């Protein structure tokens, strides 16, 4: 990343647990001193996507890694996605810092589908379902 | 702390990192007699008996000999700081040849003895400050305009266009059509007056044909105060001047596409699967985009060209006038950015090639 | 037969079609007390106690209320004909807004009840009378000057310029520099005397610097007879007055380009493949171009600016003083021209828009 | 045309014959009554351009349609040109009448290259050769 | 005698049989307002205010309605002959669908009433004029390029390829990279100027990397004269433009193979025992192959891909620019060829199927 931030040591371990179906989602945010990205909240597999959608705050950007299931015609298909949530109402300093720090997660988020959202209309399930199906040959 | 400089094409923005707005703005012109040379506002005051040349016009440096005077004026006369005790961040226009970049860093290290240097990209800095990573940036300056599509933080070199028609030509067109109401504005003293009228009274009309017909019936005019104290009346020229951007044929540029066509032709030069994402992330930038009601008109025009399955969206941040400088100022104020500068010792042991690998 | 009227900027030319020269020439001024109003030579005689305003100055109508008196004076006092029994041909300045054209035809049909009306273009009529179709026309009046490039009978709207510096300012400059030899010419009675000196004794010097130095050694002067019978001597002011046209900085107009630069800058605003043809068809017009040796000097000045592969040519017909009126007079005398007039019945059933489609 | 003149019925037929290589040139002039443009002289293909150049009169303007060949480096290339000859020594009435009547030929002279000449120096072969090559891409 | 026409993709070649070179060359474009329609150089002159479409682009007819105007313009405006009194020979691109061939002969017999018609193959005619019967033909036009291997006078339908990248894209790439030295060439008037620079100054560099590094040290430039008389300087763009042919990734075409790879992949699609003969009979054709030093560079590139037991040979006849037309002209001039034409009576008694059996 051009901003110069790095990843906390616990971030890499949390992603592997998410891959092995040990959790539903992991939320990451920049630390108080603004030097590293640290894990904030981890959710269990009981929760669904609809409950997490209500946890997004219009004043605080965050990075969310989620295991999304869309039930394609009676198939329990799941896809790993990485949501970049930067609302337009955030402070100018916060928007610049989070946008330039997206490159840090690229070294550990291999296989995750990057999704960019800047407003509540971009978090719609139909929007996500359309994007995941585009990159699948089958 | 550090120094952030945005050369631009018509005006130069300079200041210190951490500020919310630049403190020093002055035109980038060099004057000589019809003091051996005059730079900045010094040549502007004596514009009557001086010949003016632009070291940087259309976004690309044309004369390095006259460009060095611009930087020398900024450091000593304007900023009043020692160049060998601060870090300097510079920006370059899109599609900039590597020869200019190599010469740009050579001057700073060898002439001004700058300890640390860093060069950014204007399109990238403007996009990041809007909280986005993928999109298309419409930059409208005064001597040039660009459309730079950016995907995942990397621009696409094969979809960048130039029109070389921006706010500078709007002032001349407004000045020419102002003679219909009498008087004249040939001298450079009245040229600055015309510019102030453009930036305070002009606005974009949603329906060009409807306004022209109903303006004659209303015959409404507004008052503007001259420096001498006289009052000048401006009629329908307020909304006629910005219309050149949408239809550049009014100034003899038949081949020029205009704003709605420039975006459409730039998107279609990219990959088919990426075009849909670019339509929804159109970002406005530059001082020429500050006209009233411009974003609303632009969205409607693009929608007609786009197919019925595409719904374009236009993003116009309030601080789009200085997006390039604000983005650079915020980045340099980060505590972790100290490892991104290019030290002078690295240049000595590696040569001009260090900037290409870094930054 | 028909009536041909050339409003001009300083003087009005009127007459009947078929003549070789206009018979009625009078200044276009309106006078009021310091008869309620005085128009033409009536205000000129009583100029001491009257305030004068120009309804048409710089080539564009400024006040229609005072302009109607000019036409009313011409029809009744000057021509002494009924406006409702003749055909009237009018001319308009280049870059004339359509609002003026619509109001011009409205007055003739509704107020003077003119049966047939036709409006021409001054630049086009002057060019055709010279036996040419493509070229650039340099018109030098008294209150304004124009450069109109014409290609295949159609003018180019994006290469027309105005300077608003012509023979009227030459009279004032000559009057001011005449005080060096004593006396004064403040009153309007002596202002007309200065004008006669300009039109009889002044000439253009081929080499300005050489004449100034050798004039002092010769100290040659010429005699001019005043109306009172006294004899006045004129020295080196004969060739100093016309030099303002080539270098307009002598009257405080630093930004004004002058005649050789005005032509050069107007040509370069056109297409690249058409510039070569325009250089060889420079046509002079207007009363201010009647100075002796002017065409020879003008050709030399333009050649310096033009590249070595271009050889400009200057055409100066002897009858260039009234080219606009002569061309209109010849056209109206043609037997086949009877199908080109705009009838009054057409205006009733179509409105003011008929003139835009026709003519 | 703004003058109001029209073309004689025989003018259109003569131009077609010139196109089909049935003649060398056709000269057109305004009639005695000054109401229409009528054909005056037609030349056979045996004559060349040099002989016709001596037929121009300094006291009488005319319109000349010619089939000009320039022999571009051993190539028998030919180009159709339309010469507008209005000498400066003509009467003021004649110059105005001919100049304003040029638009009439535009409806029938499609494909002809318009050439304007006002003096004998403008009738030079090199001047014509330079102009014809400018508009040819090849 | 007879008429030989080569439609091509960008330009049309026409003439009479027996000549050594075509006499009529003009672009195949159709223009309409932004005369109802303009065809050929008529639309080129008024290109500013006209929209241009290509009836034949990429070598295959796209619109028959606009294609008929191209032939009508050639017969009457260009050739100035009656279509019903001469024999016409036409050529078709490789892999041409039979529907186009059936419609092509229908138009000639029914609309133009051509007495005798014959249709040839561009690849076959080009190969025979080189004194060969077996080989591979590399045709480089402007809108398309082909590689047609021919064995014993019969082409192989399963080894024909298209890239749709030829000299037309080279002009656009040269125009874009010319902005680095200032100025611009947006208008169509300057587009023709760029084309002339390509055909006179550009050349192929044997070693691309070596020339780029040493060009900066030399900084050598050449002078080109504009129509206006100004002189333009061209630097290293002379050898950068033709390099796109060898590496088409510079214009965003990553998947395109380029000239050396196109030949290699086409040969390997043929029988194993015939590949050795094809390597030694590579024949160049088309106007885009006229760049200096092109054959020398092409031979080296193919040799690297070929195995060590194969030594390719490249044949570049001097008259390769018009190989298709010259070959057709020579064939039609033969005395014994009179029995090969297709008479109009045969079409009446057999229908469109006659062309498939004959020719
Ligand atoms: N409020 C405004 N409305 C319209 N135009 C403006 C306004 N403010 C500045 N401009 C125009 O913007 C131009 C320069 O803007 P900017 O893009 O910031 O500099 P540069 O063009 O050098 O990059 C000036 O020529 C000016 O005419
Ligand atoms: N012989 C002459 N020499 C120089 N100037 C002249 C001469 N005759 C007239 N003028 C000038 O020409 C001016 C008006 O000329 P003209 O162009 O015919 O009228 P307008 O300027 O109204 O179109 C007058 O102001 C006069 O000073
Ligand atoms: N001397 C030359 N050098 C390089 N390119 C040329 C030259 N002459 C013509 N060309 C290019 O060849 C193209 C057309 O050539 P040609 O193949 O004969 O026609 P087509 O492409 O229609 O078959 C033109 O676009 C032109 O740019
Ligand atoms: Mg800028
Ligand atoms: Mg006048
Ligand atoms: Mg071809």
Residue numbers in the entry:
A (entry chain I), D (entry chain B): 2 to 139
B (entry chain E), C (entry chain A), E (entry chain F): 6 to 39, 50 to 374
Which lines from the publication concern this structure?
We show that, despite > 1 billion years of evolution, pathogenic Leishmania major parasite and mammalian actins share the same overall fold and co-polymerize with each other. By applying single-filament biochemistry we discovered that, compared to mammalian proteins, Leishmania actin filaments depolymerize more rapidly from both ends, and are severed > 100-fold more efficiently by cofilin. Overall, these structures of Leishmania actin demonstrate that the helical nature of actin is remarkably conserved from divergent unicellular parasites to mammals.
3D reconstruction of these filaments allowed us to determine the structure of the LmCofilin-decorated LmActin filament at an average resolution of 3.4 Å. The binding of LmCofilin to LmActin led to a similar rotation of the subdomains 1 and 2 relative to the subdomains 3 and 4 as described by earlier studies. Finally, as in the mammalian cofilin-actin complex, the D-loop of cofilin-bound LmActin becomes unstructured. In the LmActin-cofilin structure, Ile3 forms specific contacts with the barbed end cleft of the actin subunit. The hydrophobic N-terminus of cofilin can thus potentially displace the hydrophobic tip (Met44 and Met45) of the D-loop from its position at the barbed end cleft. This resembles a “battering ram” that pushes the subdomain 2 towards a non-flattened conformation, reminiscent of the monomeric conformation, and forms a specific charge pair, hydrogen bond, and hydrophobic contacts with the actin surface.
